[PDB]
Symmetry: C2
Subunit: 470 residues, 2 copies
C-alpha cells in the first residue's frame, strides 16, 4: 500500500554540505513521461537553503517506475560572480521549476524563475528598472551601462546596441555552449571575455540587465536526457505593472478535453508595486496553444474579485489575507479547470475556470476539510473506476509536518467532496509533487528532513488505491 | 506695444452663473493656424470651477489677429446623468485641452481628458478596472454589467458582446450625431434608448465603462469651424500601470527640423498606483509621426532619473518634490526638445530630449531667473532678426498673480539665457497659452479675475518685440 521512502536528492547534515558539496535541495517536481520514465526535478541549493545563492536546476530519471535513478542531469547552472563580496548572494539565481510534457510533440518543458545576482527576489530594484524595449516590432532585453541613463539593447547574435541604435563591439553570449549553459550572459568586447550581464556587484564589464524578475524555459526532446539552452519567456507574459512573476512549482498539465484541448497550463503568481509580498501575491496561469512556442498570461483569480464587499485587482491590491500564491492546476472531465492555491485562510482555497484557465469564476471555494498551513501543494486528476477523483497532497499541520494525501470525489457538478485523509510522512513535510504511475499506482516526490538533515531531502514514495481509502 | 485685454470667455460673478448660465471658464489654449486664424479654446465649466461636473470643450475663432471673435463652437459636450443625486459631480467629464495644427495636412487637433460620471479624477476606481481587451488582434472597450464579473466588449458597429463572445441585442452609440456629440456612449436595445455607458450612478441601463482616465481627440479640417466626433486614443498610449494619464493643457508643437521633423508633440503627465497624486505626477509627451493617425508615449522625464543619489521610475515613484506635472514643449534650431514642467521647486524646471521627445537627459535644469508658483505655463520658439529665442509666460508670484512674459536667448548648445522679464497682467493670473502672430507680434490667452469674476475669465492681449525687449 505504501513504499518506504527512497531519497532522490539528499541534503547535507547539521549545516554542512553533503558529499557532493551541496547543503540543500528544495522544490520537487515529478513527471511521468510518454516512455514511462519518471523525471524528478529540484533546485540544487549549494550554499544554503534560501531562495538565492548558487543554485542549479537539476533532474534525475527513473526507467523502472522509481526503483532506481540515474545520474543528476543539470538543466541550467548560471556561473557565480567570482568578485562578489558575499558568495551567499553572489550568483545569478534560478529557482522553482514546473515540469510538463506535451503529449503530442513529446517535448518536455522545465519552466523556472531567474534573477540576476543578488538576494533573489529581495535583490529586485526598489524602483522599476525596465527590462525590455520593443523596437520596430522586435522585443530586446535592455542593458544598463555604468554611469549612463539610457537603455542599451541585446540584439541579434547578442550584439549590444547603443540607446540610439548603433551596433557596438560588445557581444553577449545568447547561445551558451558550456555544460549547464554556465556561459549564458557572458559579456565580450571582440575576443575578450569581460564579465557577465547578470552580475550586479563588483562588475568587471560595463553592462547589466534590469534588477527584475524573469521566467525561463528549457526543453528536452530525448526524455529528459539532454536540455536546450534556456529560453527567456518573460516578455511574452509579464505586464509592465508586475513586480515579481514566478512559477507555482511542481508539475503543470496539458488540457485533455474541451475546445482548448492541447493547451499547456503552468501555474504562476505575481506581485504588484503597491504592496509586493505583503499584500498582492496573486495566482494565475500562463499557457501555450502552440506546443510551447509562445506563451500568454491568463487573468488572476484576484482580478475583479469581490473581497469583503469591495472589488480588488491583482495589479492594485493590498490585502494580506486575499493573497493566493503558489498553486496547482487540474482539468476535470467536464472541461473545467480547478486551481488549488496556497494561502492564508488555514484551509484549502480553490478557483474555477470555465474557459481553459484564461478567466476565473467569481468565487473562491474554501474547504475546511483540508488544512493549509501556508505551504505549496500538488493535486492530480485520477480515474477510479470510472468514477472521477482528485488527489491532493500537503502538510497536515499544525506546522510544516505530517504529510497528507487527501482524496476528493468530483461530483457531476464540478464540486469536490473530501472523503479520505491519510498521513504519508510523519515529521517534517513541505513541498511535494504527485503523479499517476498507471495500474492503480501513484508516486510522490516531497520535502522532508530527519537525523539532522538540512532543509530538505527530496524523497519518493509509491502508494495505491488501498492506501487512499484508509 | 501691449494691447488692452479683450475677454474671450467670461465667467460669472460672486459665485453665480454668467448670462449664459455658466459659472466658470478655465484652461486656455491659443492656436495660430496656417490661414492666420486665432483659435482660442477653454473648458466651459457650467456648474462650478472644479475639474468635474458638466463641462464642454469650446473654442472661438478670430480672423483679424484677435480684434473680433466669432461665436463659441462646442467641440464636445457629453450629456449629464439626469438621475444623478449630486449634479455637481453628476456628468461624464471632459477637461483640459491641447491644440495643435499639422503644418502639412492642415488638420487641427484638440486633445483632452475624459472621465465617466463622478468627481473627475477623484471618481476613478480605487482598484484597477481594466478598460480594454484585445481579442483576435482588435482592441475593444470593456463594459461592466451590474452583478456580473466578466468583461463585456463594445465591438463593430457598437454591438455589445458577452464576456464569452456572443452578440447581444444591446448597442452603443459609437458614431454620435447630435450637436457637440452629446449622444456619445448612449446605450440602446433595438431602437429604445436605455441610458449611457458613461453613467456610473442611478443607472437606467445595465452597462458602464471602467472608472478610469481617458484621452480623447477631435480634429478640424476647416480651420476650427467644425469638428470630428471624439476619437479614443487612450489604448495607444496608456500603459497598464498608469493610473491617471492627462494632457498638460495649452498648445503642442510639430517638430520643424532634425530626424523627427513632422512629429506632433503633446505634453501629458501620469500618476501611478503607488502614490497617485501625492508622489507620482510625472511629465512626458505623446507623439504622432503619421499626421495624427497613430499615437505613442515617450518615456517620462522621471524614468531612471537620479534624485538625491537614488533612481526613481514614474511607475513606482513616491516623491512629492520630484514630481513634474503639466508642461509646455519647444523644439530648438539645433533639434533638441525642451520640456518646461510645472513643479514644486519654486523655479523653472526644464528637461531636454535629444531624440525628438522620446527619452530625456539625466539632469533637470532649474532656472532661478524664472519663478514657478506651482501652476501651468506656456512657452514658444521665436526667431527675431533672425536670432533664436524662447518666450515663456506664467505667474510672477508670490501667488497666482502678476502674469509675466519671460524672454530667453537660446544658445548654440541649447542652454537658455534669460534676458527680460515683463509683467502682462496685474492681479490674478493662472493658466495661459502663447502664440506667435507674425511681425513679430505675439498673442496670449490667460486666466485672470477682477470685479468679482469667478475663477476664471479668460482674456487675450497682443504684444510686440518692443514690449518683450523692455528693460
Ligand atoms: Cl560584469
Ligand atoms: Cl445608464
Amino acid at each position: 500500500a505504501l513504499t518506504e521512502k527512497t531519497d532522490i536528492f539528499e541534503s547535507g547534515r547539521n549545516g554542512n554540505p553533503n558529499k557532493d558539496g551541496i547543503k540543500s535541495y528544495r522544490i520537487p517536481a515529478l513527471l511521468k513521461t510518454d516512455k514511462g520514465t519518471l523525471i524528478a526535478g529540484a533546485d540544487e541549493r549549494r550554499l544554503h537553503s534560501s531562495d538565492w545563492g548558487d543554485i542549479g536546476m537539476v533532474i534525475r530519471r527513473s526507467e523502472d517506475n522509481g526503483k532506481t535513478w540515474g545520474d543528476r542531469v543539470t538543466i541550467t547552472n548560471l556561473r557565480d560572480n567570482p568578485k562578489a563580496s558575499d558568495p551567499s548572494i553572489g550568483s545569478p539565481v534560478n529557482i522553482d521549476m514546473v515540469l510538463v510534457q506535451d503529449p503530442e510533440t513529446k517535448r518536455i518543458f522545465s519552466i523556472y524563475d531567474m534573477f540576476p545576482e543578488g538576494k533573489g527576489i529581495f535583490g529586485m530594484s526598489s524602483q522599476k528598472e525596465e527590462a525590455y524595449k520593443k523596437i520596430d516590432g522586435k522585443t530586446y532585453q535592455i542593458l544598463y551601462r555604468e554611469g549612463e541613463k539610457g537603455a542599451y539593447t541585446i540584439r541579434e547574435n547578442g550584439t549590444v546596441y547603443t540607446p540610439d541604435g548603433k551596433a557596438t563591439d560588445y557581444r553577449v553570449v545568447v547561445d551558451p555552449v558550456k555544460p549547464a549553459y554556465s556561459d549564458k550572459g557572458d559579456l565580450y568586447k571582440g575576443d575578450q571575455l569581460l564579465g557577465n550581464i547578470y552580475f550586479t556587484t563588483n562588475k568587471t564589464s560595463p553592462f547589466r540587465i534590469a534588477k527584475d524578475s524573469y521566467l525561463w524555459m528549457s526543453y528536452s526532446d530525448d526524455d529528459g536526457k539532454t536540455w536546450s539552452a534556456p529560453q527567456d519567456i518573460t516578455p511574452m507574459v509579464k505586464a509592465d505593472w508586475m513586480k515579481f512573476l514566478g512559477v507555482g512549482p511542481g508539475t503543470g498539465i496539458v488540457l485533455r478535453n474541451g475546445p482548448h484541448k492541447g493547451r499547456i497550463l503552468i501555474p504562476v503568481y505575481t506581485t504588484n508595486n503597491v504592496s509586493h509580498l505583503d499584500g498582492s501575491q496573486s495566482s494565475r496561469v500562463i499557457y501555450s496553444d502552440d506546443h510551447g512556442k509562445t506563451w500568454h498570461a491568463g487573468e488572476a483569480v484576484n482580478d475583479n474579485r469581490q473581497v469583503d464587499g469591495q472589488k480588488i485587482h491583482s495589479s492594485t491590491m493590498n490585502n494580506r489575507r486575499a493573497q493566493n500564491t503558489e498553486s496547482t492546476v487540474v482539468q476535470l472531465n467536464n472541461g473545467d479547470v480547478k486551481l488549488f492555491m496556497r494561502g492564508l485562510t488555514g484551509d484549502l482555497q480553490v478557483a474555477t475556470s470555465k474557459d481553459g484557465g484564461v478567466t476565473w469564476e467569481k468565487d473562491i471555494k474554501r474547504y475546511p476539510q483540508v488544512k493549509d498551513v501556508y505551504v505549496q501543494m500538488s493535486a492530480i486528476h485520477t480515474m477510479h473506476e470510472g468514477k472521477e477523483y482528485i488527489i491532493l497532497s500537503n502538510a497536515g499541520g499544525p506546522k510544516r509536518e505530517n504529510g497528507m494525501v487527501h482524496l476528493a470525489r468530483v461530483e457531476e457538478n464540478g464540486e469536490l467532496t473530501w472523503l479520505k485523509h491519510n498521513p504519508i510522512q510523519k515529521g517534517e513535510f513541505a513541498y511535494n509533487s504527485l503523479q499517476e504511475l498507471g495500474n492503480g499506482e501513484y508516486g510522490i516526490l516531497y520535502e522532508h528532513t530527519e537525523k539532522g538533515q538540512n532543509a530538505y531531502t527530496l524523497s519518493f514514495r509509491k502508494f495505491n488505491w488501498e492506501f487512499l481509502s484508509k
